[PDB]
Design a protein around this ligand. Structure first.
Ligand code: HEM
Length: 249
């Protein structure tokens, strides 16, 4: 259902050059998980019924950074500011989604297609649209489905983003990585979810909700057994996420 806007040749040149600069920067700084979180929290505020929120540059606004769900993302915004300044033609909206795409790639994940043209919008969405880690499947559907308009498949695949990074007790309150290899994008999130709780690794209640839901559980099993299928479905879902409200939406 997408009709992507035309952008100028100079805009597309900058996308390509920014993509390369983002790879080097993100790899050097070891901040891929944080940049994935920044892109996801940028996009995940989209409400389909009102066409508000979504990936339109607003996460850099102090008002949106102050949302509790976004604790720590001010670090991400600050980290990208010097690089962004080298690409004045790009929207913040695009830059942050591109950083998200690059974060998945440089940690060994799928190549998520990227289309430019998101405009930076003036008003951040209201607080409280991002998911609550202590809730379960009904909540996940309200947030990903009723609000964002993503599918049950997308929910499970996107939960797989936890294959990189960690929680921090000073940000969410939760603490530690989901996997033994938190800078490697692979299907290990699902493998760990199936094996039970191993000391040192994190499982949120929202992760565990995938195991007991009749639609989510077969997807967890599929992804744990078939990393290729995970990568395919992940790439589809991340593209959709990154394009909520954009290019028809
Ligand atoms: C399904 C509902 C979700 C819940 C409840 C949730 C919740 C959380 C929480 C509580 C944290 C820890 C923040 C911190 O303390 O530093 C976190 C981190 C993270 N989340 Fe999720 N998340 C969800 C979905 C997603 C999605 C869809 C993605 C991207 C596809 C994602 C990517 C990440 C990443 C990469 C981190 C690690 C950040 C870092 O290492 O600094 N999450 N999430």
């Amino acid at each position: 259902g997408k009709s992507y806007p035309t952008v100028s040749a100079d805009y597309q040149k900058a996308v390509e050059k920014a993509k390369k600069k983002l790879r080097g920067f993100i790899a050097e700084k070891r901040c891929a998980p944080l940049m994935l979180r920044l892109a996801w929290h940028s996009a995940g505020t989209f409400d389909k019924g009102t066409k508000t929120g979504g990936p339109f540059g607003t996460i850099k606004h102090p008002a949106e950074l102050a949302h509790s769900a976004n604790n720590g993302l001010d670090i991400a915004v600050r980290l990208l500011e010097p690089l962004k300044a080298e690409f004045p033609i790009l929207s913040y909206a695009d830059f942050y989604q591109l950083a998200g795409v690059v974060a998945v790639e440089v940690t060994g994940g799928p190549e998520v297609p990227f289309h430019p043209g998101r405009e930076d919008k003036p008003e951040p969405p209201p607080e409280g649209r991002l998911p609550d880690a202590t809730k379960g499947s009904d909540h996940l559907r309200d947030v990903f489905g009723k609000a964002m308009g993503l599918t049950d498949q997308d929910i499970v695949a996107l939960s797989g983003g936890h294959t990189i990074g960690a929680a921090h007790k000073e940000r969410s309150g939760f603490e530690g990585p989901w996997t033994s290899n938190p800078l490697i994008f692979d299907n290990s999130y699902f493998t760990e979810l199936l094996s039970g709780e191993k000391e040192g690794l994190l499982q949120l209640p929202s992760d565990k909700a995938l195991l007991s839901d009749p639609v989510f559980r077969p997807l967890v099993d599929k992804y744990a057994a078939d990393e290729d299928a995970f990568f395919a479905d992940y790439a589809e879902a991340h593209q959709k996420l990154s394009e909520l409200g954009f290019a028809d939406a």
